[PDB]
Every structure is written in C-alpha cells, then in structure tokens.
Amino acid sequence: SHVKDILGLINAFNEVKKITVDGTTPITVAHVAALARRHDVKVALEAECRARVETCSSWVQRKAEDGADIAGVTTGFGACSSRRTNRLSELQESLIRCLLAGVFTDELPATATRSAMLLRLNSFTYGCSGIRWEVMEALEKLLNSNVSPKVPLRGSVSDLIPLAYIAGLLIGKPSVIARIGDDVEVPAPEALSRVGLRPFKLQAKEGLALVNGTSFATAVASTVMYDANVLLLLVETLCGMFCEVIFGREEFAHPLIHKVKPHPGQIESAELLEWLLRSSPFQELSREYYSIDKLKKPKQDRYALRSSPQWLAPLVQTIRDATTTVETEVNSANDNPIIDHANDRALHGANFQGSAVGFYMDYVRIAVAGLGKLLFAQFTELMIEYYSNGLPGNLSLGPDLSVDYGLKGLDIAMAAYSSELQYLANPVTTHVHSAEQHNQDINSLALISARKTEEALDILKLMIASHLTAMCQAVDLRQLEEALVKVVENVVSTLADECGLPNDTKARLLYVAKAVPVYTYLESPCDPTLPLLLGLKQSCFDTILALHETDTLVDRLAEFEKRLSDRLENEMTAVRVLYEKVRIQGSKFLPFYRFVREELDTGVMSARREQTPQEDVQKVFDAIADGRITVPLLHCLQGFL
Amino acid sequence: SHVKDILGLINAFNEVKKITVDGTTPITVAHVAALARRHDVKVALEAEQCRARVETCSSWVQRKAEDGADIAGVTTGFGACSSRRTNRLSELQESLIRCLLAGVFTELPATATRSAMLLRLNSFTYGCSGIRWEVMEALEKLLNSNVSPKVPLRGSVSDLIPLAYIAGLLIGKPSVIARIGDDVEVPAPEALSRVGLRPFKLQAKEGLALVNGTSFATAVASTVMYDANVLLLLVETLCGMFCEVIFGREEFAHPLIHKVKPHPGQIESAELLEWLLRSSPFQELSREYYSIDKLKKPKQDRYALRSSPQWLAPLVQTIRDATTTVETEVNSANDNPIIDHANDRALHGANFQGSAVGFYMDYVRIAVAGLGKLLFAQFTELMIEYYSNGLPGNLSLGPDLSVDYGLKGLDIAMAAYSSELQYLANPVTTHVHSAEQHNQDINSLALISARKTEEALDILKLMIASHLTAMCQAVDLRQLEEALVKVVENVVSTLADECGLPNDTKARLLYVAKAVPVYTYLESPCDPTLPLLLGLKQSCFDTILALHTDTLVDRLAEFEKRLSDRLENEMTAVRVLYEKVRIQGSKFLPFYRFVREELDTGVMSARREQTPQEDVQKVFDAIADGRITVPLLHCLQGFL
Amino acid sequence: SHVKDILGLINAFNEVKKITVDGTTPITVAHVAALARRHDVKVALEAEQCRARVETCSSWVQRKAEDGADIAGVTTGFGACSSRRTNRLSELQESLIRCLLAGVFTELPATATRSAMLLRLNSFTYGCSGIRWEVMEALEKLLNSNVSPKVPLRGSVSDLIPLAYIAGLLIGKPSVIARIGDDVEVPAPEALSRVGLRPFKLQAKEGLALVNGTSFATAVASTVMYDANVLLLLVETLCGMFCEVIFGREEFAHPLIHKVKPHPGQIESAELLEWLLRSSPFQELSREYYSIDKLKKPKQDRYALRSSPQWLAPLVQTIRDATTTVETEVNSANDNPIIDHANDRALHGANFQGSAVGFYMDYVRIAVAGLGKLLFAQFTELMIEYYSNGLPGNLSLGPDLSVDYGLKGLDIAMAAYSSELQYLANPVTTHVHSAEQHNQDINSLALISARKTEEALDILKLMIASHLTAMCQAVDLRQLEEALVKVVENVVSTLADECGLPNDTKARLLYVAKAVPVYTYLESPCDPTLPLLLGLKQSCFDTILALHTDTLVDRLAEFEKRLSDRLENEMTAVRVLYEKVRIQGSKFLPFYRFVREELDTGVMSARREQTPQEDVQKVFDAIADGRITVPLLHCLQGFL
C-alpha cells in the first residue's frame, strides 16, 4: 500500500543522520527534506567514486587542451556553439559572468539553495561531468557548514542563472553575497575564508558543469513531493475523523465496492478508512442516531464523505507517481555534454532539460487543488446544521448564539483558500516561449511550476490546520451532546415519576427527550417556541386523547411543565460548565484530539474561551509546518497492515 | 517498451471481430475504439459466464424491494432526497428518468453514444446492478443493429442526463429520437419495433442502474486514449524523420545519455530514435555537411530535436498511465448501490464518481499540448533558413521565390493550432461547483474534461498532418539539393578544363561549388550578387595573387562567360527531371511513399496546382481514419 | 442608461431593411447581426458616396506598382519575405492566395462568413486599400445572393487563411466550394456563373487587400457583442423576477445605496430593478410573509439577489465598452499598406492586427462567466427549501414527492453549465507564439478568442432558458401556495366553530394555519408528524392548560379527527383546479404569458407528460431565435 510507503518516508525523514553521496546509493525526497530542514543532518561524500570523478576531469582537461571539439568546452554556449576557442578557462569565467543576471526584488530560500547544492553534488558523483573532486569536497564542506549564496527568485526556464550563484560562491566572486546560518551575510571570498576554503579557478568544462543542471527545480520539487506525501496521508486519515464527527455511515469504505472499481488509490484509501472506523465508538453513536426516526433521515451521506475513496484515487496515484519521477531526476547526471571517458568521447544531448519534473509539477498542483476541494466540501457540511446531523451551525457552542458566531471566520477563510488554490492549479508548462536566440525552442519551466506547487501546498497546510481544528471542536460538541441528552432524559424520567404521570405519558415524553436534537434548544431549553417544549406539548395533547380522570391528569401535566422550567436548565448548565472546566478515548483519532487539546493546550471554542480562532489554528498550522503532526499520525496508524 | 504496447493496441484495433462481454475478460481502449469506428465489429454478450449472477442479482433486488428493505434509490428518493421512502417501486424508477430527460439541443456523436452503451452493458456483467438479463440482451441487440438515441452534448457533472437517453430508448419514450444507422431517425418506440423489441417496464432499481454510471465520460476517454497512444507513437517516430531532413546529429539518442537520466519514457523514446537513425543515408549527408567549413557551423542541434527524448518522457508516461486508469474504469461496476447478494447487502458508496477519469483527462490534455509544442518548435526551425542547414525559407522550391511563398500558410496555421491547444490544456477539475441541493459537493466533471482532451487531439491531428507534409517536402528538397550540387560541381570542373585553368584554380572553384548552399542561389545561379559567383570571384582574386597573368585573367573571364552560358540550363534540366535516392534507404520510406504515391501528391511549387489544403487534407484524413498506421507499422518492422 | 442603449440595439436589429455601406455611415453590431440572421436584409453599396475615392486609390496603386514604386506586398514579398522585390504584379497576388488556401476540414458557419464579407466590403469603402470598385460590387452581389465560400474553422492568428477562401471564390478557384442558400454547394466557378459574375484576375495589391484584414475575428465578435448585450439585459431584468418568486426584499435596489457607491453599471442595474419591483403584487406577498413570525426569519436576503447590482456593475461596463471597441473595428480600414493617394504615399503599418478585438473578447468571456455564476447562485437558492422561503425542494409540486424530483435534472445541468463556462473564460491572448518565421512575434489570436466567447454565450443561453423555466414554475407554486393557505384557514375556521371551540382556541389554530409553510405538509396534510398537525397539537394542549374540561377535550378530539374529513379533499380540489392572480399585476407577466401561453407549457409535475427537455427546449429556441425580445421589450415599456 501507498500508506506503508508514506509511513516509510516519514520514518526515513526523522531517522536519517547522514546523507551518503556516492554515485550508487539513491537519495530520496525524505533525504532532501531532512538535509533542508534538520541542520544536524550531514552530507558524507564517500570516495570509495572519487577515482571515476578524477578519470573524468583528467580526460576533459587533456582532450580540451589537445583541441577536441566539445560543446561549451572548446565551443561557445547555446545558440553560439559555432564559435570555437582554445581559451579554456576564460570561456568558463565568461559563462558565469554572463549568467549572474538575476535581480533582487524576494529570493530562493536557503532551504532550496542548500537542497540544490546537494543535488548538484549528487549529479557529479556519476563521473560524467568533468568537475574536479576538490570542487565536490568544497560543496560537501559548504553544505555541512551552513553556507549558501543568496539567490534571486526568478530567471530560470529550467537552472542556469540560479546555479551561477553557487558557481559564483565557489570562485569567490565579490558581488556574490553568501549566507552562513540565519543572519550572517558576507561577500563570497570571506564566506569561503570563514569555513577554511579558498576560491577556485575554473578549468575546462567546470563553469558549465556547475550551471548545466536541473538542481533548483528538482530541489523544490523534492520538498514539494515529501510534503505532498505527508499531507495526502493526513487528508486520507482525517476523512475517517470526519466520518466520526458528521455521523457518517462507514459502509462507504466496504472493500467490495472498491474491489469492483479497482483503481489502486481507491482500494488503498478505503482499506485505510475501513480499518480506522472498524471499532469506532463514534460509529456506534451514528448507528444509534439513524435508528431514531429512521425514515425521516438520509439513507446515505453526502459526497464529501461517501465519495472520498473515489475522489482520492487519482490524487494518491498522481502524488506517488510524481515522487518516483522526481527521485529519478535527483539520481541523474543532469548535465551536458556527458563524458563517456571509458569510450573516449563526449556525448551531446540535453540532460539539463527539466521536463519530467516540470510536467509532473503541473499534475501534482491539480491533485493538490483536488485535495483542497475535498477539505472545503467537508468543512462546509460541518458548518451547516442542515447537513451536520445535530451539530450547531458554525459549530457554535453558545448557548447564547447571538454573541457566538463560532467558526464562521474560519469558514469564510476556507472559501478564500480553496478559491486561490484552484487558480494556482492552471498549468505552467503550457506557457513555453521560444527562448535564448531561439536555441531553446522547447523549455521545461520546471522551477516556476515547482514554485507554484509549493505555494499550493502552503495553502493546503492552512486548510488542513482549519479542518483539524474544526473536527476537534466537533468531537467536543458530540461528547457534550451525549452528556446533555442523558441529563434531559434523566430530568424528564424523574419528573414524570414525581408528578405521577401514567406510563403512556412517560414513554412519549422520554421519546421526545431522546429524539429532539439538543443543540436546537440549548439556547433556552424551556422556551415554549423551541423544539423540546414543542415536542413535549404535542405528546401531552396526544396522551390526553389516548387516555380520555382528565382534570387530575391535566393537573399533573401542568405541574410537570412547572418543575421542568425550575430544574432542567440548571442541570443542563451544570453538565456543560463541568465539561468546559468518553467516546474519543476509544477512537483511532484519540492521538489527534489529545495532541491538539493537551499538547498544544487548546479547548472547546466559545465566548468564554479568550483565545482567538487565529491563536488556536496557528498552533495546529505550526505543528503541520514543522512536522510535529506526524507523531499523532503515526500513533493513529499503529498496527495498520 | 511502451512502443510494443502501442503496436499491440493498434494490431488489436485492426484485428478484433467480436468484443466479448462476460464480466471477466477485459475490454481495452482498442476494443472500444474498434466498436465505435468499425461497424463490422460485433458485441458478444456471453450468457454462460454471467447470466446466472445477473439473474441472482435482479431477483434479489426485486424480492428485497417488495419486502420493504431500505435501499437508496430503490425504496428511497434520489441524491439529496434519500430520506423519503416509498413502496412505489416502478413509479420511482419512471420518475427518475422523467426528471433526467433534461438536456437541450442547441449533440454527442453516435460513436460516443454506442461506446457508452457498450460500457453500461459491461458494468452490468459484474452482477452488482440488479438490472434484468433481458435488458442486457436488448442493449446487445441495439448495439449490433446500429440503433442509438440522439443525445444532448451537455448537462453531466459525471453521467445521469446523457445515460437517461439510453434508458429513454429502452422504455420507448416518444420524445427520445433514435438513429438507425446513418440515414434513419425515428422516435424510440418505432426504433424498438424495427429491431423486434418492445418497451421495457422498469422494475426496482432498473432506472437508477441504467443512469448511475460513468459510461459517457469513459466512452469519450477511451477513444481519446486510443488516439493519444497512436498519435504519441507517431510524434516520437517523426522526430527521427525530422532529424533526417534538418541535418541533425543522431548522437542525441545515444543510450548512455539516457541511461544516466533513466526516466522510462526518455530511455524508450531514445531507444526508438537510435534504431530509426542507425546507418541512415540522410545522417550520412548530415556528416558531410558538418565536415564542410566545420568550425563555422553549430556543434549541437537546437532543442526541438536534441531535447526530444527528455521532452517526450513525461508525455509517454502520462499517456500510458492514463490508459491503465481509463481501462480500469471501463472494466468496473460503476453503479450505486452495489448489490452483494451473496451476503444479503446493498452497499452504499459512490462508484458513479468519474474522478479517476476526470483528473487523468486533465493531465493527458497537458501532455497533448506538450506534444503540440514539440511539433510547433520543429516545424518553425524547418521554415527558417537560418535554422534549417541549407533548406530554403518556407521550404519554397521556387526557383522564382517572388511567386512562391511555399508553406508559409501552413506555418501561420501551426502557430494558431499550438496557441489554441495551450489554452485548451487548462484544467476542468479545478472548477467543481457544489451541485444538486449541495449533495454533490465534490463532482468529477469527467465528461467535460474528456470532451476538451478530445478537442485537443483534433488539433494535434492537424499539426501532425502539416508536419508530415512539410517533412515530405523537405525530403524532396534534400534529394534535389544533392542532385543540384553534383551538377554545379560537374559544370565547374568541366569548364575549368575547357578554359585551361591551373590545378590550383580548379581546386578552389570546386570547393566553392561544394561549400555554398545551393538554395541561396538557385533563383539566379549566375547573379554576381548571389553566393555562388561571390565565392567564385573571391577564389579568382586569390588565385591571381597566388600565381602572380594577362592570359590567366583572359581565361578566368572566359570561365565566367561560359558559366553563364551553361550552368543555369543544366540546373534547370535536373530540377525539371526531378519534378516529372536517399529516401530509398531510410526507415521513413513507407511514410514518404504513402504520402507521395498512395495519396498521390508531389513536391510543392508554383507549377503544382494543388493547394496546401488539398495536400494536407489527404494526410489529415489518413491520420483520422487510421490508414496512417500502415506506414507506421511498416516503418517499425523489426524494432525490438 | 445602458438599458436604453440596448433597447436601441434590439429595435435596430428588428427594424433595419438595408445596410448602407458608404464609407461614412457607421455599421453597428445590430446591423451585422441583422445581415447574418435576416436574409431579407440587403446590402446597399452607395457609389455616389465613395466610388470616386475607391477608383482614385486603385488607379494610384496600379500606376505606382507598374512604375516600380517600392510597396510591401505589392512590389515586394509578404511578411518575413518583404526584402524580395518583384515586377510580377498579378502573379505575386495569385501566389499569395495559393499559399493561404491552407485550412483543413476536420467549419465557420455561413452567418460568420457572410458577416466577414460585409466587413471586408466596409473596410474597402474608406479608399485606402487599392481594390477595384468592381470587386466591391461583386461582394455586394454575392452577399445579396446568399453565396458564400465554405471556410475551415482554424488557422488564423488574426485573418489571412479564412479570408483567402473569400478571395478564392472571387477568382474562381476550383478547389473552393461555395454555398448558395441552405441547400446547394458547388465549386467556386459555377457559383460565380449562377450569379452572373466572372472570375476576377487579381491586379496589383488586390490579393493582399482581400486577405489582410480582421474581418472574421470582427464578424464573430459583432454577433457575440449583439448577443451579449441582449442576454445581459435579460439577466438583469430576470433578477427582478427572481426577487418576486424568492420573497426578496426590494430595498437592495434602493437608489441611495448605489448613489454612495456610484459604479455606473451598479446605479443603472439598480435603477431598472427598483422600477421593475415598485408596484409588485409579489413584493406585497413578501412583506406579508416576513410580518408572520418576523423574528424567526432572515432580516436580509442572500447575496445572489441582494448583491446583484454590485455584481452586475463590471459586467455591464465590460459588455458596453467592448461593444464600442468592436464597432470601431467594424468601421475601420483594417488593411496594409494604407494608401494615402492624396499625398502620394503607401503607409506601412499594422492595421491587420486584431488586438483590440482579441483583448476585449477575453474580457467579455470573463464577464459572461460572471453572469453565469449569478444565474447558478440564484437557481441553487430556488431549488433548496432551506433557502427558498416556503417553496418546495426542487420546485416539486408533488404532492407525492417520492415520485416527483421536480427540476433536479435541470439543477444538475446548471452546475455542469457553470463549470464549463468558468473553464472557458481563461484568456486566449496570454498564448501568443512567435509566428511566421518570427515576423509575427506579437499576434492577437482574436478569432480564436471570439470563438471561445461565442461558445460561452451558447452556454449562457442554456442557463437563462433553465432559470426562466424555473421561475415560471415558482410563479405557479407561489400562486397555488396563496390559494392553498386560504383553504386551510377556511377549513380550520369553520371546523373550530362547528366543534364549539372557544374564540381564543380558534384564533391560535388560525394563526398556525397562516404561519406554517403549506409545502411542508401538502404531501399528507393530516399526517400527525408533519408541521400542520404538530402546530395544531401544541395549540390544543395550550388551550387545555389555559382553560384548566371533558367536553372541551371531546370537542378538541373531534376537531382533530374531522380534519381528515375535509381538509385533504379541499386541498386536492384547489390544486387540481389550478393544474387545469399575482402575476397579472406583475411587470414580469409578459414573460410568464410567453412561456405558458405562447410556448404552450404548464406547471411541471408527474401528471404533466412533457419532459423538462421539451419545456426548456421551447424557451431556449425563443432565446436563440430572438423571439424572447418581444416579452422583454413589453416588460420594459415605459422605463425612463
């Protein structure tokens, strides 16, 4: 299952200490994200591939000096390949001068730049580039010392310009500013000095080897894919939590439905959902709910739940397939020419072309928009009492609703999030311009597309934060609902006894107490115009007709109504105040609820809780953003398969 | 390789005579396309494999419904109205169809409608729907007799409305119009009567079972995917023909380049291209071209060729992966509720949701726009003399270029095609509205997206037809080029002898004859301002300096004189002969022969009265109708 | 107001008999639409006005060209080939047409082609083109004889290729096919023969003059803009009908709201709605409805109604501004070079560039998607009982809702329509490719854009047809609702008397009869679990408490029981009578009368055999063919 694979990715991300870089061991997107996000993670360039790098650089320098005809080595660049030259080093310097052509408006973050440095280093290990081993050592040292050039955001059609800043750092260009850690910014020569390095003088092919790759597009794509995997699993998992709070019917996940429409992501998402819901105490409450006035309640849930495995299917498949493609790029010799020293030739192709990554970034962004739409639809149902099977509008606890609009602010924001996400999911690859003196008449735009997919995932994180916050609110509301109905049942049962009401009467009144949704009268339980009293009055008329001594019965019914308005509200208030100052304990989602409520220190939202929706959602968003959210996720999924 | 898989689809499409429909044998996109496109193809619904499970299921449903089992859309209302119950089993199903006959004629083609009928029939064979066997037999007979309802284009969010027209035909609704073949349209009851059927009276679940599927989206997606596979292979293949006519360097396809960046589609497209170009006689002309004035010509080709395997990789993978997804949908019980009669349950889910198809239709449309951009970039290079390595601008033969703008009209149209294609490739699935009393708060829009991808492929067909036409033109221009240079060399060599020029002078003049691109002076070979005489004059001045006289000057003046007597006539003669060879040893011979001989065309010029339209129409028609697969399969004979 | 301007356009469309083409009188979008759609409308080319300047100009060009003047595309090659000079004046023009007959049939409708012919003729009247007057006479004759070439859909980046087919017809190219009326297709030479014309022999500049224009993009844009104006006014107007049936509060249109946020389209749409709603019998019912249980009902309407003027503002302004721009293009010399014969120069520019039209087609398509979203929002509200203030879900009459899903099918199609419309409204102009040997490195794509906006308007027409059909259903439901509540009140009143209930009891019971929405219990009025009996039970218990006996209880039990004697029977009788009033005093009467009486429809239900398709088709056809303007103009009589 993809679920196992994604669990493996999260474990790899957490557990890795050293990234082995050797030209044979694959680097995964979890490795890239770990390097970028955990500075205790170190690169270990393992020589055992040094010999082949050396053979390659020796071949290049010798052949170039002998006058071999090799594009971008003894010839001009791009559309200028007709021009030949024996000025081997000057050719390489002229390239970097030409490409230091970005403008600061905004910049690629250090996370992306360090990731790109890793990916360039990795490419060099295959022994096809002709770069000196010493330059590779320097990259390893820069990576492990938290040094990176400041790189302008735009200019790549995929990654000459941004890679030129890494080259600029290595050759000690004074105009190139380098970061060391979070605040220090110094010119390149002093950055090199601070970490015990000296500037390189570029030899044959070395300028081109440094800039002629897909490292920035693929770096961003790697963290994008790591995040898309984690957030996909989170969304699939939270569909079960939605089913719990909305009073869904877990049958939507039945294996036979999916066996007969066997898209792999459809089968796998449902398999997870069936397992999450199998022993659910909330599904027990759901069954009890639909057995009361069965024929007045929907037979099936709305699509945002019942259709979730069908919806998720292409999203799972897209994200998993795109992960394979990005990792193939990470572990490639993206460079040109490709030096085949074993056969004494330089091969002229286009491995710098980032089209595999670019197209898949467009697809993943559409899939991400699909995930956001699922979240938006679920959230919408949860906010509307007509669709939420007993929950109050806006998940407002009240009881005074005139001064408690609940999660209405979050609801409005969810629409804004989904709307921007759908806009972002238009493709970038459809916008190919004929570029660079018409030499680059197809080009991938892969870094641009990866950047837009990253922006989409940022919005998805916000939507997940909100949805999880709303579902924790709904857990509290469902627990309080159960406690409140029992209080109402007990008060009605005991007052029927006290007032000496007949059994026909007692049975009718208890039915009303069980059947009427408590959140419809919580605001003023003894209001004669609200559903509890309306139900009770209807039943009182019916019992009088059924039993038709009349005057003594009426006497006792009037007394019942009097004592109800003296005690009911007080008992309902007490249980609520107690709750503010259980089913979730038996649920697979207990780790999420516990994390949000206890670990992040939050509570049921109301006019009495002084923290803002911002303050609460911020805590959840921060935990999604920094990866702490994977702890409850892995706890929740323990034992699955 | 995907190449063998696609060849397999093509052979299946052409070879199938009967489509077996039995609940276990898979239907591929080739089977769907063959049914749609070849009326000789018949459906064979196999009773022995599946009648028993179908009958068990319908009996179960009718018995449970009559006993008051609570089953959504069977004893309850539809969609947002599932909370209402009823024992009016038939009337409930009638009311559904009445409600859904809601399209407007401002239609879906018969190909798509018959494909959808096939797909609905297939869904029923899994024994989860509750429909009667007799209705399935009626669908088979309608399919085999070329009877299908006229269906409105729009209304589906994925396929209640369009499927209701098939239901409408089955129950003999007078407002539903049915085609019988190409020439007859009659009301539904008359159609049933003409093929010996009577209208069905809907039983429990049967109206819902007929409409609650993904049949139209998946029907369109199936022919879309068949076409996308064929056109993909054609585009990949034609990258090799482009290399041949543009004077490319075949090294771009070297397997080591792709071994070190091993996207499967990159490896596999390069593998095909290496094989197509191996020992090519055109690649031999290319080598010679780059050996002449070597240091003044590009070391590498432009991206439209050199970067082609890298570009193709995601496009190959998208199209092959979408094919798998669409075929899983074709072979699924797309219906709800799903009847597990063996365990006495009606299972409530959403197999009517066409999301797997819809999302993949969005992706394929992006991939098709990628294929179009590749074609546009190659065609652009081919039209511009600065980028075509000796070819004339617009592939104009002339010789009089003032009255021959060649393929400039096709070039303009290629920009228009690519532009519209890029626009079409925006996603449909990003436009989900919360629909049907907010019950359908996610919905796939799969049929809309499939229709847009279908529109995109129509345009790609146009682009391939033009590109292939242009490359046949370029084949003729390269062959004429080789013949012309030999004539110029012969005339120069024999006039050098005749005029008694030194061996030094003879050699210099022959180099110019070899080096100057003939298309730069074909218009007026002896014009002193054009590159032939310009090179000759330069060489004549140098030779006077190297030998320094009065008689040498006399002889060189006699050479120039005699050149203007002889050269143009001999060049005209060889061109005229050509209009009234390397391609014979090229793997692309079957394409050139198909376009020139079988479709009856010729090198384009002011002397050929057929318009670019007339020539491209023939090629486009052969792409549209499948004839193009013959030269394609011939071309690839022996590959792997 | 833009309202008066649109009424002006409609009147012109209907009343024009002859289009005057004279080089000074403007042609509007109503004129283009009328020529395209009304064949009795004839072109009148006026010689006295512009023949002299035409003849002066064609004489200047022929003389200058024959004398060797250097003029692009006249004595030089075309586009990227302008450096090539020639004295082959006629053959240069022939070579252009040959090169541009490059479209493929996979076609533009005759309406668009004939509109394009009108527009090319118009451009020629400015006397800047050099075309012969006789060619202009031939276009007038072809137009008036209903002869037009068959033109391929694609190939223009804006309109050389499609215009080449008009040129092909005029010069009698055999490969060009011509329509004569609805039924006849012949080769171009026979078409000319039948109208007494002979093939033209192109003189200097004339091939270019025929093709170097924006005629097709602008022809499509003209009918698009005419339709956008009519449909805009229809949507605005129908917002008032929506208010009436939804029980809106007309105060949203109050002039002060819009004076303080004075976007011209906001003020003018609100001004119309204020006037439409001012003496409304439905707004009277609305106010009565909100006076009953006032504090339990919304203070404000939802945005689809209350925010309509603010929403409409940019859409009105976009559509009106685009009309101006399109008309400027219709009335322009879109040609190149521009001959200034009076100053003896040929001016080299780019008036063939259709960028003004292209960009505005993108904007209008965005505005059309805005209008579609407004209709979708209103339709959605109307289908959902929680949002419709007493109307039944799906506007189902029932009474048995288990077999009446009302307009659910139409609701689903409205989501499908809006979804596709939002997708279409992505821009085309963002997809400029560098075209035609990189000569056309900016190009407008105006025809492609115009075509997409036309497709969006087709969808908007379907949405308006559905929305108007739904609102007529709602009118019937509101009128029936008022009649039904009166029946319930009378039954309750008389039974309360007959059972000898106290006056206080009678008054409480009557309040329930008035306050409970009748559509919540119409299905089974005496059902003890539905809201009528629930309210009566509560009231009966409260009476017992208030007066706290055995005779009171006996009489209350009799009241309840006798309710099932008469109530359902009288409610059935009044409904059945209705099936076989407020709208008579409403400004929307003409629409209701048009849909019900003129189109022959009725309140939708399980008893009415017509399908939703059959009903919506009639409304759609009337929108499409312009009949809908009759009730629109009647509705608006007396406005300002």
Ligand SMILES: *N[C@@H](c1ccccc1)C(F)(F)C(=O)O
């Ligand atoms: N990627 C190409 C390039 C183009 C412009 C400037 C620098 C480099 C390349 F020419 F170097 C190549 O390897 O194809």
Ligand SMILES: *N[C@@H](c1ccccc1)C(F)(F)C(=O)O
């Ligand atoms: N697909 C659903 C439907 C909705 C509206 C009209 C007809 C059918 C369904 F309700 F039938 C379902 O199976 O969920």
Ligand SMILES: *N[C@@H](c1ccccc1)C(F)(F)C(=O)O
């Ligand atoms: N619009 C130009 C053109 C380009 C290619 C073929 C025909 C015409 C033009 F060159 F004619 C011009 O007027 O700029």
